[PDB]
From a paper:
We thus designed an expression construct of NR2E3(217-410), which lacks the N-terminal region that corresponds to the flexible loop in TR4, as a fusion protein with a non-cleavable N-terminal MBP tag and a C-terminal non-cleavable His6 tag. As it is in our case, we readily crystallized the MBP-NR2E3 fusion protein in the P2 12 12 space group and solved its structure at a resolution of 2.8 Å by using the MBP and TR4 structures as the molecular replacement models. Each monomer consists of a canonical antiparallel three-layer α-helical sandwich fold comprising 8 alpha helices (H3-5, H7-H10, and AF2), with a disordered region between helix 5 and helix 7. The dimer interface is a parallel coiled-coil formed by the helices 10 of both monomers. Instead, the C-terminal part of helix 10 bends and collapses into the space that corresponds to the ligand binding pocket in other NR. This space is filled with hydrophobic and aromatic residues (W257, F261, I381, I386, F390 and F391) whose bulky side chains protrude into the cavity and, in this conformation, do not provide enough space to allow ligand binding. The kink in helix 10 and the subsequent collapse of the binding pocket of NR2E3 allows the AF2 helix, which follows helix 10, to bind in the cofactor binding site of the LBD. Hydrophobic interactions stabilize the AF2 binding in this position, with residues M400, L403, L404 and M407 in the AF2 helix forming Van-der-Waals interactions with residues from helix 3 and 4. As a result of the occupation of the cofactor-binding site, the AF2 helix would block the binding of either a coactivator or a co-repressor to the LBD and would therefore be expected to inhibit the receptor’s activity. Single mutations of L372 and L375 to arginine reduced NR2E3 repression ability by >50%, and the double mutant L372R/L375R retained only 20-30% of the activity of the wild-type receptor.
Numbering used by the authors:
A (entry chain B): 331 to 372, 1215 to 1282, 1289 to 1410
B (entry chain A): 5 to 372, 1215 to 1281, 1293 to 1410
The structure:
Amino acid sequence: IMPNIPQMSAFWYAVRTAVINAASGRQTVDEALKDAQTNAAAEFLDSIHETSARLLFMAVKWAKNLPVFSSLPFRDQVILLEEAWSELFLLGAIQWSLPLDSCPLLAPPEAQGRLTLASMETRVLQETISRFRALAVDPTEFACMKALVLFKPETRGLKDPEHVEALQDQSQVMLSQHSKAHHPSQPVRFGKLLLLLPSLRFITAERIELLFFRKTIGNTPMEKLLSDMFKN
Amino acid sequence: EEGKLVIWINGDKGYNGLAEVGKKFEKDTGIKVTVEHPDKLEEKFPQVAATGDGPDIIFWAHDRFGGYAQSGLLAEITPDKAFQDKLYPFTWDAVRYNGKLIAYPIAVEALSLIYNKDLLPNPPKTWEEIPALDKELKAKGKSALMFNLQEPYFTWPLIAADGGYAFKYENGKYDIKDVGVDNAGAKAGLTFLVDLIKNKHMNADTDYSIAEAAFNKGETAMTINGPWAWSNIDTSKVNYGVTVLPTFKGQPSKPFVGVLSAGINAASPNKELAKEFLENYLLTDEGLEAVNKDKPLGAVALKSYEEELAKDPRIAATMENAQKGEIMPNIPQMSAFWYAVRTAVINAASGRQTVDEALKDAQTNAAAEFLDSIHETSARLLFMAVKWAKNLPVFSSLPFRDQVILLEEAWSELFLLGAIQWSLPLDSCPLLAPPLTLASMETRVLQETISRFRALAVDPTEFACMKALVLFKPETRGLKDPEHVEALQDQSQVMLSQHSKAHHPSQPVRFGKLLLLLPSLRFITAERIELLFFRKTIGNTPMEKLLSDMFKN
C-alpha cells in the first residue's frame, strides 16, 4: 500500500536516479544504492529542488523581456529556448549559488536530508561554480552570457539565422565592453568568460532533467513550460 | 545440425534457385538443405561462426572471405586436381589464402563497356579516341561516354590500365607495403580521366543514378557498368550492347574482378557433405542453371557452363573484361586503398588539386595501416594529439604528472578537434552510416559542428591555439603548478586573437566565434565518443590506455 503522506516523493526520485545511473556505467551496482539510501531518506530538501522550475521560468521571462528576442520569428524564439534551456538553467543556478558557501546538497567532507548528488556531477558542478566565483562574474556579465548561449545561429530550423548571428555578435561586444571596462587589469578576461561556456554542457540536458527537475511526461522541462503557457 | 547443411546467401542472388538444388540433394541423400538470406549476412556470419554456430556453407564476394580465413572462420576446402580444371584457373587465385583454398568460386563479375547500337553501332577500342568522339555525338544533342565517376571502383580500370595496381601479388599472397597507385602508368590514366572533364566531355559530378538514367533513355552513347545494370535496361529498351573496355596506351583496362564464392564453415560437422553438395551438385551445368534461372549470375567460374553462356555476347564480354582485370585483394588493407583512391579521384576531378599530388597522397593512405577501420584511424588521431602536445616546448617544462593529468582530462576535446580538422577538406571519413537511432542523431550534430568550423574557415594556427586552450585548463583538479598552466592558456588566448585580427581584420568578432566552437566539443560525452570512434578498454579511457601503453613499451 502507498503511505498517504506528503513526504514520500523522494522514494522513487532516489531509486530512479539510482537504477538509471547504475545501468549506465558511471556507477557500479553497490555505488548507487548508498546514494539512493541517503537520498530517499533525504526528504528534507527535495521539494524545493524540483521547485527549481522558477529558475527555468525566470530564464524564459528574461528572454521574453528582451525586445530583440521578441522581434525574432515566433518559431525561432521557441527553437532557441528549447535548444538552450539546460545552459540557461545552469547559468541561473550558478548565479543563484554564487554568493553561497554551503548548499542544499553537500557531499564530501564530514549530508542529512539533502539530495546526495552523484560523484562526477558534484565534482564538476562544484568546480564549475568555483570558476565563476573566482572571477568577478557580475550581473551584466551573466546577462551577456545568457544571451550568448541563447542566440545560437547554427541551431537548425531557424527561419532567420543571420539575425540570430547579429544578436550574438552584439552580445560579445556587450560582454567585452563591460569586461574590459570594469577590469582593465585583466587583459584576457573576455576569453576566460567565454571559456566558461563549455562547462554548461559537461552535464547533458537529459541528466539536468533527471537530477534537478520533477517528472515530465516524455517532454523536456522547457517544452512543458511553453506548452502550459499556451493552454491558457 | 550435424546430419544436414544450412546455407547463407544474400537476397540479390538466386536464393530460390539454390533451394531447388538443395531439395534434389535432400531427395537423393536424405540431407535436409535449408537456404536462408539473412540481412546483415556478411556481418552476422563473423558472429555466429566466430564462436560455434551459423551455416555450414556461406556465399559471398571473395574479398570478404579474407577476414574470415584470418579468423579461422573458414574451413580449408580440398578439391581434386580433376575438379580444379573444371573452373577457370584464375578464379582459384580469388579464393586462395596463405596458399590454401578456402572457398569454391562460382560466378565472376566485372565492369564492361555498355553502348547504344542505335547511336553508336561501333564503340571505340581505345580511350584516346573518346574525346574527339564526344564532339561528333554532341552535335546531334547527345553524349559519348557517361559513368559513375564517384566511386574508385568505377574509375580504376583506366587508372590501372598502364601499370596501376592496388597491392602487389607476389608469392601466393599480397604485400600491404607495396602499393602501385602513384606509378608511371598511374598518373597516366588519372590525368587522362581529369582531361575528359577538363574538356567538358564528362562531368566530375556524375554519379551512378545519373549515368544509369542518362544512358537508359538515350542521352548517352556509352557507359561503364556491371551485369546488375543489364536487366534494369530491359524495363526501358534502348538497343544496347556489352563489349570490352577501351584500351589505354595500348594496354587493356584493368577492372576489379569480383568472385561470388562459397566457403565452408570451419566449425561445420558437415565439411564432407557441404563439399559433396558443392562439387557434385551446385558447380554443374544443371546445378548452376537452376540458380541462374531465378536470378542471372552473369559469367560463371565453371568452364562447362560458362561456354554455354558465352553464346550471350553480353556475358562473354564480362568474362573477357574480368580476365584482363585484377582480382580484388581479399586483405583487410583494401579499406585504406578504397579511401585513398576515393579522395585522389574526386580531388583531381574537382580541381581541388592536381593529378600527381592526389596520387602521392593516395600513395601513403593505402600503405597507411590506420585507415582500415574507424577504430584504428581514431587511435591515430589521438596519438597525434599527444605527439602534438609533447612537441610543444612549454609542455615538457611542466610537472610530469601535470602533463598526464592534462592529456587524460581533455582527450575527448583534443581528439574531436583532431578529427574535425582532419575532415575539413574531405567530405567523408569516420562517421557516415546510411547508404533515427542515437548513433544517428549524434552524427548529425557532429557533422553540424564540422560545418561550423568550415564556414569560419579555421586555419592550422587556429586549430593549434584551440588545442592549447583545450589542453591547458588550470582548473583541472590535481595539478601541481596550476599557475603555469593559467599562463600558457592565457598566452594561447593572446596568440589566437593576435592571429585572428591579423588574418581577418574585417571580422572584429572572429576571436569570440572561434572560442564559441569549443562547447560543441563537449556536446557528445567522452563516454559516448569512446563507444563510437574507439575500441575495447573496460573501465578505461583511450588516452589512459594510450598513455599506459607508452609506459609499458
